[PDB]
Amino acid sequence: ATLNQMHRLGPPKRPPRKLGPTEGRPQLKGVVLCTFTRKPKKPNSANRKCCRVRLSTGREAVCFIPGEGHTLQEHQIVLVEGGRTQDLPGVKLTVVRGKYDCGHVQKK
Amino acid sequence: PMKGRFPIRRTLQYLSQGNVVFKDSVKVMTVNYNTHGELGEGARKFVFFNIPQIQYKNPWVQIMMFKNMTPSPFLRFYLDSGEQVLVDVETKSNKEIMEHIRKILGKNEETLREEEEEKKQLSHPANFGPRKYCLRECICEVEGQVPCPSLVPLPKEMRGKYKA
Amino acid sequence: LRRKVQEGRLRRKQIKFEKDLRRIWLKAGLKEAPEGWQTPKIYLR
RNA sequence: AUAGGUUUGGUCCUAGCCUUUCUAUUAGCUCUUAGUAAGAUUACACAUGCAAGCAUCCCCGUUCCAGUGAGUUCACCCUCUAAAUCACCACGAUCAAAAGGGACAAGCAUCAAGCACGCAGCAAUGCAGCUCAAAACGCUUAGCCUAGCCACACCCCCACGGGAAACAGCAGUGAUUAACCUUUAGCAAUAAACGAAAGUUUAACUAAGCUAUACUAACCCCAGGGUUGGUCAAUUUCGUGCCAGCCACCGCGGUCACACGAUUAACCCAAGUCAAUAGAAGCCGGCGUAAAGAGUGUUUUAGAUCACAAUAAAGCUAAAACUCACCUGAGUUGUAAAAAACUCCAGUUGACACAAAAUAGACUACGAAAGUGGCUUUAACAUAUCUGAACACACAAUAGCUAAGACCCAAACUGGGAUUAGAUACCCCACUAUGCUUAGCCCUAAACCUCAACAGUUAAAUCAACAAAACUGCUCGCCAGAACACUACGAGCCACAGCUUAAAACUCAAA
RNA sequence: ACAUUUAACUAAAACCCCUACGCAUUUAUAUAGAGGAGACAAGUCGUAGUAAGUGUACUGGAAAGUGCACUUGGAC
Ligand code: FES
Ligand SMILES: [K+]
Ligand SMILES: [K+]
Ligand SMILES: [K+]
Ligand SMILES: [K+]
Ligand SMILES: [K+]
Ligand SMILES: [Mg+2]
Ligand SMILES: [Mg+2]
Ligand SMILES: [Mg+2]
Ligand SMILES: [Mg+2]
Ligand SMILES: [Mg+2]
Ligand SMILES: [Mg+2]
Ligand SMILES: [Mg+2]
Ligand SMILES: [Mg+2]
Ligand SMILES: [Mg+2]
Ligand SMILES: [Mg+2]
Ligand SMILES: [Mg+2]
Ligand SMILES: [Mg+2]
Ligand SMILES: [Mg+2]
Ligand SMILES: [Mg+2]
Ligand SMILES: [Mg+2]
Ligand SMILES: [Mg+2]
Ligand SMILES: [Mg+2]
Ligand SMILES: [Mg+2]
Ligand SMILES: [Mg+2]
Ligand SMILES: [Mg+2]
Ligand SMILES: [Mg+2]
Ligand SMILES: [Mg+2]
Ligand SMILES: [Mg+2]
Ligand SMILES: [Mg+2]
Ligand SMILES: [Mg+2]
Ligand SMILES: [Mg+2]
């Protein structure tokens, strides 16, 4: 582009950054609606422990439960952080272990 | 690389190399020059190289350019009193034009030095305040004075917790 | 079905155009439209 | 950025994503002492106690300080000039409103027109003007340019009036949020108010309380968190066996797992660690083939320095068809071979187009492009700087659509003949729209030399590759991962499932 | 819509208007129904001639084809 065209267009206008599943917040409180398991996309195979939660914003979202063994039931309160589960398409929220009802993974 | 011919012209160093600071009387400067013709060649360079520097040093002075309206290139300065100053620049080099306009309507070096000295007085070294305005924030930074409690805890005797 | 949707949209466009035209003379102070004014149907052949 | 990982069987190029760095908040786990700084998520609702008095009565102050960030170009400069302080006989300085002039955030042009937004006159009134693609008008977002400033003070912009009964003063509470400080003391210092003054008052402030949020310093005993496949510093033994599980990207896990779990050891940082989130750091690069030169030309406001085969008209026709007529024959057409069809058929001869224009042309011309190749004639092929538009002004092959006309031949469709074992869509016959003329539409092409227009150079290392040797100056147009998408919506169009302009969400680590 | 009174050997008193908002207007949310995009799903799931194209228009013996023009990013 010529100098006249650069002057006319002006400085580059970076588009506003996209808000993620947490809406630009570190964590979100949620109420567990139902628990289930999902299968990975294929290079892999597993039964990934997931749960659907209604977030404090009111939206329902699917979240992954990390670690070996969880005791989440309906109506329980959890804290969900960001970070995609690479194996599960569309699962962009993760439950925080050791907060509210979701306890730490039991030793061994 | 930087676009255009002579990209040095679009650097703040080059723009600040200008040596013409007009007196407060000069309000408008019209530059009538010819795109072609050897006799106005220097005038063309004056437009190409020196008008940016003049404008940078004189932001509030209206500079306007005109092309191929008269047989010869010239400059006209309009003053606050209504007086007009005409400077014929045909057959002159751009350096000659710069030197001439500096001589006839430019502040001399003595006046500029006086202005700089007047500026210096504003930033009094003894004043304490933000770095943006002052050399020091607080007298605690002066050697020999009682230091800041952030770095050197004050002795128990001069602190209110142990004076109460 | 796209004909019905399209003609409904054209009707809504005509209604919007008439509403804006009305807004103008209402704001200007005229209680009614300019004497002898009639909004043409520009979005229908 | 001193960069690095990742597309492929492989190389090169282009291009996105991610890593390494520095801060802030929150979460997990873990936390010893001292000094300092800082400290609700919410303009939601607030129990309780305090936060404005002073003073011989008048006045003065409570319009300040303190708080919040809801709204949002009221803050800055100049002119003029109130109120205020001091001169206080004013001369005038300082400070600073109202008014006039100028300046002043971000995103969206799919917000492109606003609709009275100007001028002249003492007025009556006259003129028809004013803003705007150099962004008017409009929608959305946000306190700002921080010795501080602006705005607000429960809401109705405002507060006569109404809702209704107000902590966005300090401490404190409820609800809410990922977000969580004491219902301390004193006016001893400074500041403010008042007083002639000694002085009085002040949740400003000062001195304390709480909190790893941060900085500084320490510690006799006292170390935790994360990590160990590569990027990237650092794994022994077992357990499990595509399960359980793990990863920021690439990826690991199917009986020898340095990648999961435990354990050992090691690495980094350390009273912290680092999981999530949010910032810090972005186009002087490109457009034949990767995204990008959008079919052609002109000009505006501006910027730059380079100052014979065109097209419209009229006429005309040499071959070959069709049709008509005589003479002759019984067959003609059709193909790999046939059947249908025709026999008002066929051969010679003569007459005879609103159709198409052998040879020349092995030429390479004309025209802006699209296009233009039978003959004659009449008009006729812009501009003595260059650039200059999806939209302005004029054009745009073929196909397609309105009205009329012509019809030899060709021919989408439509019928019929012939064909395997679901025939030939394909071959044969007949015949439409259409190909032609006249007056209007439609506005698309592999509209391509897949090379934007002008001016210049051949010296350099020629140069990613291929294409078509490599470049320079200047201008306009256009492009910033893939797909969604030659799409949806908006807008415009003689177009009506048509054309032009042209997104977003979800998804992926590539393409 | 609406109006100059008292007073005046020092000087003063007195002063107060009524009308709006709607079947108007802007944007947004919710609801019947309809339609797209992506997801090449995971396997103790299955298997031994007519050159290319770009525009258009048509197709009722359509596993693709045809008509007209154009391109070589084909062959000779
Ligand atoms: S800054 Fe001066 S004592 Fe702290
Ligand atoms: K007083
Ligand atoms: K604000
Ligand atoms: K308000
Ligand atoms: K005091
Ligand atoms: K071509
Ligand atoms: Mg890369
Ligand atoms: Mg590979
Ligand atoms: Mg922490
Ligand atoms: Mg005064
Ligand atoms: Mg003012
Ligand atoms: Mg739109
Ligand atoms: Mg534009
Ligand atoms: Mg705000
Ligand atoms: Mg108010
Ligand atoms: Mg409070
Ligand atoms: Mg309140
Ligand atoms: Mg906090
Ligand atoms: Mg007190
Ligand atoms: Mg404190
Ligand atoms: Mg391990
Ligand atoms: Mg391309
Ligand atoms: Mg082209
Ligand atoms: Mg031009
Ligand atoms: Mg444009
Ligand atoms: Mg056409
Ligand atoms: Mg036609
Ligand atoms: Mg026909
Ligand atoms: Mg061009
Ligand atoms: Mg893209
Ligand atoms: Mg379209
Ligand atoms: Mg062509």
- State the amino acid at position A49 in one-letter form: K
Tell me how the structure was determined.
Answer: cryo-EM
Q: Is the CB of A59 under 7 A from strand E?
A: no
Structural domain harbouring C31 = 1-45
Cβ–Cβ contact A19 with B under 8 A: no
Those residues with Cβ within 8 angstroms of residue C20's Cβ, 6 or more apart along the chain or in another chain: none
Can you tell me whether residue B28 is helix, strand or coil? strand
A-B C-beta contacts closer than 8 Å: 3
Atom of ligand 1 nearest to the CA of B138: 2
Check if the beta carbon of residue B31 is closer than 8 Å to that of residue B66: yes
- Closest Cα to residue A30, out of A70, A88, A74, A67? A74
Calculate how far, in angstroms, residue B135's C-alpha sits from the geometric centre of ligand 15.
Answer: 45
Domain count, chain B: 1
Q: Residue B7's closest chain A neighbor by CA? A: A3
Q: What are phi and psi of B59, to 5 degrees?
A: -60, -30
- Closest Cα to residue B33, out of B103, B78, B87, B85? B87
Q: In chain A, which residues have their Cβ closer than 8 Å to the Cβ of B4?
A: 3
Those residues with Cβ within 8 angstroms of residue A38's Cβ, 6 or more apart along the chain or in another chain: A47, A48, A50, A62, A88, A91
Round and report the angstrom distance from CA (B158) to C1' (D219): 25
Domain count, chain C: 1
Residue B65 DSSP label:
E
- Closest Cα to residue B43, out of B21, B19, B75? B75
Atom of ligand 1 nearest to the CA of B148: 3
Those residues with Cβ within 8 angstroms of residue A91's Cβ, 6 or more apart along the chain or in another chain: A38, A48, A50, A62, A63, A64, A84, A85
Hey, which residues does A48 pair with through a beta bridge? A38
Helix, strand, coil share of chain A (percent; to 5)? 5, 30, 60
- Closest Cα to residue A88, out of A50, A32, A52? A50
Q: Biggest alpha carbon distance in chain A? A: 68
Compute the distance between CA of residue B96 and CA of residue B43 in angstroms, rounded to an integer: 10
- State the amino acid at position B164 in one-letter form: A
- Closest Cα to residue A101, out of A82, A80, A86? A80
Structural domain harbouring B107 = 1-164
Check if the beta carbon of residue B49 is closer than 8 Å to that of residue B9: yes
Check if the beta carbon of residue A80 is closer than 8 Å to that of residue A27: yes
Which residue has its alpha carbon closest to ligand 1 atom 4?
Answer: B148
Angle at A86 between CA A82 and CA A88, to 5 degrees: 95
Compute the distance between CA of residue B21 and CA of residue B53 in angstroms, rounded to an integer: 10
| Interstrand relation of B84-88 and B74-79 (parallel, antiparallel or unpaired) | antiparallel
